[PDB]
């Protein structure tokens, strides 16, 4: 996952120091190697972490490895009907579970929130929809705008 | 050396620019970026 | 300024009065983009930490909108938040002639060029660095050590 290439000869070592994923962070090769295997940049990253856990305060996360578990998977539920970070976040909100939190999950609750995303892909490709599409048929939220 | 100095972040740096951008069009097209910029900067991109 | 409003496109008319108002954000900008709205507002933060696009008109002035637009095309050049190339140009030779950059620096921001490339060119980068490595060692060695 990450250290194939070694970055600048470095391993990532499991410890217990944060990592700030805040975008104002300016931070080492663990934000690097982040990026590297996450195929992502700062700000998607930064909106990922909110993804996996509306609880955080900050980009201060723990270095063990549920955490990392949380960001992979994350990534992973955009990855296998290929979307992006912010169309993942959009998603989650058209389907209504945007308040519900990936780092404290029930198994069988899990299996079903994938399940709920797949009828929904496999729906949209049937109707041949743009996520934008129903997001806009979808909103609640209205701009205020004469 | 008859032929150094050698930064090797440098290298990283320049190559890095010009594996994305050749000819340093996006970044002279729009020019207040290169507003920012001195050109002898410039000249270390395609220069080493 | 009319190919920007042609790229808007179906959202023009209330983008166009926001803009003829003097309450135009961010975030109803990026939403006719579909940008994040936070690589705006870093953008404009980036800005406004050079030389002056004043905070009232950061979004009144069609002129700072062309600007952060072009700090957003720099960004999306290189993959990268635009928070990360305000140390790149502040590591000029003589602009910050008074503070030499330290080699840590150009490490810095050497490794966040580094994040944002793909397979073709993290391989040729390798190549090349590994050649520039060998005749830069060498010589050294020649010189020095033998």
Redesign the interface.
């Known amino acids: 996952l990450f250290n194939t ?1 070694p ?2 000869g470095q391993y990532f070592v499991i410890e217990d120091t944060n990592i700030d994923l805040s ?2 962070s ?1 931070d ?2 663990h934000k ?1 190697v982040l ?2 295997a996450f195929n992502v ?4 990253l ?2 990922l972490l909110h993804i996996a856990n509306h609880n955080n305060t900050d980009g201060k996360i723990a270095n063990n490895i549920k955490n990392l578990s949380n960001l992979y998977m994350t990534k992973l539920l955009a990855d296998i009907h290929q979307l992006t970070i ?1 169309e993942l976040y959009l998603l989650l909100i058209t389907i209504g579970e945007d308040k519900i939190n990936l780092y404290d999950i029930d198994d069988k609750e899990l299996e079903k929130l994938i399940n709920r995303l797949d009828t929904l892909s496999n729906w949209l490709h049937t109707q041949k929809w743009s996520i ?1 599409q129903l997001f806009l048929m979808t909103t609640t939220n209205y ?1 205020k ?2 | 050396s008859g032929t150094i100095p050698y930064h090797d972040a440098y290298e990283n740096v320049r190559k890095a620019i010009q594996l994305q951008d050749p000819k340093l069009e996006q970044f002279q097209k729009s020019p207040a970026v290169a507003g920012l910029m001195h050109q002898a900067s410039l000249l270390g991109i395609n220069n080493s | 300024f009319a190919n920007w409003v042609n790229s808007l496109g179906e959202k023009a008319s209330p983008i166009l009065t926001a803009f003829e108002n003097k309450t135009l954000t961010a975030e109803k900008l990026a939403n006719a983009m579909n940008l994040d709205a936070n690589l705006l507002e870093q953008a404009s933060i980036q800005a406004q930490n050079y030389k002056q696009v004043t905070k009232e008109n950061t979004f009144s002035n069609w002129q700072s909108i062309d600007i952060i637009l072009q700090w957003t095309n720099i960004a999306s050049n290189l993959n990268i938040s635009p928070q990360g190339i305000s140390p790149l140009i502040a590591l000029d030779y003589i602009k910050p002639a008074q503070k030499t950059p330290t080699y840590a620096q150009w490490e810095n921001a050497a490794i966040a060029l580094t994040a944002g490339l793909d397979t073709q060119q993290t391989h040729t980068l390798h190549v090349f660095l590994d050649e520039s490595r060998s005749t830069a060692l060498s010589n050294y060695y020649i010189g020095k050590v033998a």
């Open positions: 290439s970055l600048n975008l104002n300016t080492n090769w690097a990026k590297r940049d700062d700000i998607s930064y909106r912010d934008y701009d705008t004469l």
